[PDB]
């Protein structure tokens, strides 16, 4: 079997184990986690499997080991603006993206797959999401972990979006495909979108973009309030978050 997509990230086994040990050292609330158990549960999800035949059930053992409650009122979701979202939680250190949780941290920027009836990780090729399989070891992992993360969110949930995208809100992102449809009005009062002016100077109100009106319509039918804010100056936004009641701001 040869796929269209790049193979498993080189040194995947080392990276997953080292990330697990580092995260559980930095976060003493997760010190109970056995990182050997985490590796065996992760590997066990997909090794010896046809990589388009991975289910959410295949990840249940890893999900159970990685069980974690972050403050439900301090969640940042993002779509197509990951690096700025991560920089935000690096400066506003009480807030969490999915990749600030143990399971999100383990898998961030990695690709992985195996092959039917072999014991080995495939470093040669993995199914491409677009060309081979929408349901692959990576997409199934992110669907299962991100649903659980979105489900747990409460009060005011923030989502960071990229105002320089053709579609500022799109339904193929993890956010647009799974997270937005798992915010529960039992827990969530408001979704507040931050539309980042991340490219050329652009003075326009991008909260009037048709895709933002689509997002507003989706979360209105979930009985959740919608708020939208332009971030015209993202670098100044990060600075002002670190040091508020200072400078220009």
């Amino acid at each position, epitope marked *: 079997q040869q796929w269209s997509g790049p193979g498993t990230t080189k040194r995947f086994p080392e990276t997953v184990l080292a990330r697990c040990v580092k995260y559980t050292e930095i976060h003493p609330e997760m010190r109970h986690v056995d990182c050997q158990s985490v590796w065996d549960a992760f590997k066990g999800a997909f090794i010896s499997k046809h990589p388009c035949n991975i289910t959410e059930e295949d990840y249940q053992p890893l999900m159970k080991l990685g069980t974690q409650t972050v403050p439900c009122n301090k969640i940042l979701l993002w779509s197509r603006i990951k690096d700025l979202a991560h920089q935000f939680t690096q400066v506003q250190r009480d807030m969490f993206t999915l990749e600030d949780t143990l399971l999100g941290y383990l898998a961030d920027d990695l690709t992985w797959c195996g092959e039917f009836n072999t014991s080995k990780i495939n470093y040669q090729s993995c199914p491409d999401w677009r060309k081979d399989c929408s349901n692959n070891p990576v997409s199934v992992f992110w669907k299962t972990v991100s649903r659980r993360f979105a489900e747990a969110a409460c009060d005011v949930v923030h989502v960071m979006l990229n105002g320089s995208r053709s579609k500022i809100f799109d339904k193929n992102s993890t956010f647009g495909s799974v997270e937005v449809h798992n915010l529960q009005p*039992e827990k969530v009062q408001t979704l507040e979108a931050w539309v980042i002016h991340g490219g050329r100077e652009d003075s326009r109100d991008l909260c009037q973009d048709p895709t933002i009106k689509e997002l507003e319509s989706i979360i209105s039918k979930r009985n959740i309030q919608f708020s939208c804010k332009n971030i015209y100056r993202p670098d100044k936004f990060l600075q002002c978050v670190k040091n508020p009641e200072d400078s220009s701001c």
Partner: antibody
Amino acid sequence: QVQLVQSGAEVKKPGSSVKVSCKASGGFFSHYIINWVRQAPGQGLEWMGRVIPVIDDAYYAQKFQGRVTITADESTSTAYMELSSLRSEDTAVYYCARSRGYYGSFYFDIWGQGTLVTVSS
Amino acid sequence: EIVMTQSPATLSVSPGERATLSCRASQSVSSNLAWYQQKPGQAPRLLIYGASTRATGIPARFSGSGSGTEFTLTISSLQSEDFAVYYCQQYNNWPWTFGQGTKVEIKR
């Protein structure tokens, strides 16, 4: 809804499935939710799950996730609760109950008359 | 989940007299507390929401009080139609939880 009208009493063998209907007089009002609550004979009330009718979006108590399906059909103004792999301990009166559907108002203002489900060998 | 505990299990009250029912939450539920009346063969009926706000058409003799972990339903003069089971319910923390109820029976 102004009234919730449930289907009649059910008698089931263990391991079987039951589907209880809840017809909304006046239809599903915008931003109201249909909840399902059960009561074992001589015991208290237990919230099971709900549906947002306009998007047929269900949300379940962990106790019932994987065994209950709650749905709503806007076309017929009818909500359903299907409980599968029935156990003797599922013997209860099942109520559909309206709430406001938004954060901070999840109390139950309009209740169906209840449906008795008896599960026994 | 938040555990709701009601006391007493049974309250014997003379017609025309006052009933005081207690509801305790395992942790604070602010004022997001509802009260229901249930008679045999009937669905629960909403009496109070927001700890102290009477639902539409509920008589003035029913009053609710309390905040945080400790709540009271007072029926100031018991009519024959008020003899029933009473349940509290928190809507501060999902999943929604109910007390196991107080039966108000007729003293004679």
